[PDB]
Amino acid sequence: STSDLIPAPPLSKVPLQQNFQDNQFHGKWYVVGEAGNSLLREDKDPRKMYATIYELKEDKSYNVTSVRFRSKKCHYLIRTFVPGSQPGEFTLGLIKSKPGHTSFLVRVVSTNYNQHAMVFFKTVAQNREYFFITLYGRTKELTSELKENFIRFSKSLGLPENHIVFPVPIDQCIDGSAWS
């Protein structure tokens, strides 16, 4: 908790998806890749794939559900992503109308809505800024050129290769259908 950390990048380096469309972004995404400044690849017990489901409310905010396989059971979390200043940016927590003192911040960096996306996350604890990036997929598999591009972008925010992980696909919990 006192060890050194790779600095979170300026928001000048984390651009948003242009003309971002909240209605096209909704629905289920598999987390195909992950990167972060506190994230270390551990091949003795790897990180498993999980899914998020972004449901667009009348609010214009998202009701984001995470589904994970953990301790031999399916685990469900629900959070509210409130929209920030620009389309594709979201906040969580109680600090909102005070930019750059935000508890937890989300930015959709790029997406083609029907196949893939890259989302940047940033939060604070004990005066230390943590940041994290996900490579979302509409399916569990993605193309090697999309993963290479994720590695490329992650390096542009200052992460080396050993801070980048591609979760192992799993059949439990994460292939649930659901009406909307």
Binding site: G36, L39, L77, L94, F104, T123, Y130
Partner: protein, 183 residues
């Protein structure tokens, strides 16, 4: 390698979470690792160790209104347990500095300091006499106000006033004091 079977949360505040568990019985057990993660994306925040006799630990420096996964792992020499994981959301931060001013025989003024830079949807004032707790009043106060004046109070009577901050349906722990009216 045994897991803890009774991990629980206590002292849940806006920036911190307490843990209690019953330490196990083994010569083999050397300590307990504690892992904190930001839930959802599963962002690792920190790890921490305590020794085999310890059945208590406080996570500090957390951010209010946010979801964290906290787990405890039993440690042996060259090995360990499966994690025991729980998910907990930090509280809404309460107000501070409850003063009572303008003491009449049938009225008082109640001031508090809001939690700074937190955007609440409202405050929530409850008052009742000390001697009849069943007769409680609730006023919903604007998140931009920091004071309310109470009226129609009984003279020579001690009241319990509490102020809680509220965001959506979650509310803070109450800020509570006691002022009595004059005659």
């Amino acid at each position: 390698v045994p897991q803890l079977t009774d991990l629980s949360f206590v002292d849940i505040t806006d920036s911190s979470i307490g843990l209690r568990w019953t330490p196990l019985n083994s010569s083999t057990i050397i300590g307990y690792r504690i892992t904190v993660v930001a839930a959802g994306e599963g962002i690792p925040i920190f790890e921490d160790f305590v020794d085999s006799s310890v059945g208590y630990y406080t996570v500090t420096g957390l951010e209010p209104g946010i979801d964290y996964d906290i787990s405890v792992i039993t440690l042996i020499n060259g090995g360990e347990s499966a994690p025991t994981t729980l998910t907990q959301q930090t509280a809404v931060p309460p107000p501070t500095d409850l003063r009572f001013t303008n003491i009449g025989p049938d009225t008082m003024r109640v001031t508090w300091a809001p939690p700074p830079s937190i955007d609440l949807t409202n405050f929530l004032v409850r008052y009742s006499p000390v001697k009849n707790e069943e007769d409680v009043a609730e006023l919903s106060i604007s998140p931009s106000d920091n004071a309310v004046v109470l009226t129609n109070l009984l003279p020579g009577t001690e009241y319990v006033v509490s102020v809680s901050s509220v965001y959506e349906q979650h509310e803070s722990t109450p800020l509570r004091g006691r002022q009595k009216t004059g005659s």
